[PDB]
Amino acid sequence: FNATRFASVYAWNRKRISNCVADYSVLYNLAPFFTFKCYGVSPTKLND
């Protein structure tokens, strides 16, 4: 999320995340990330 450079839309970058504890409150509490609408799962339930 804090990467200096993002790739273009056609050459979208893909990252693998596995084998770690994930806390979703670190990104949720940030003000700039306004548009956070979530499909197939509630945004609140992500912590569980």
Add this chain to the structure above:
Amino acid sequence: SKFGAISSVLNDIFSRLDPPEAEVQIDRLITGRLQSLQTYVTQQLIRAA
């Protein structure tokens, strides 16, 4: 049977979704299972006759 819902197990629906749409999913599942049970009872009545 999923009956057109995302999952066929109830606790998944509770644990993944918010009440506003979890209620829709639960409603779909409940109507499906009620229809199944009513069909069973109707065939049982016919066979009993």
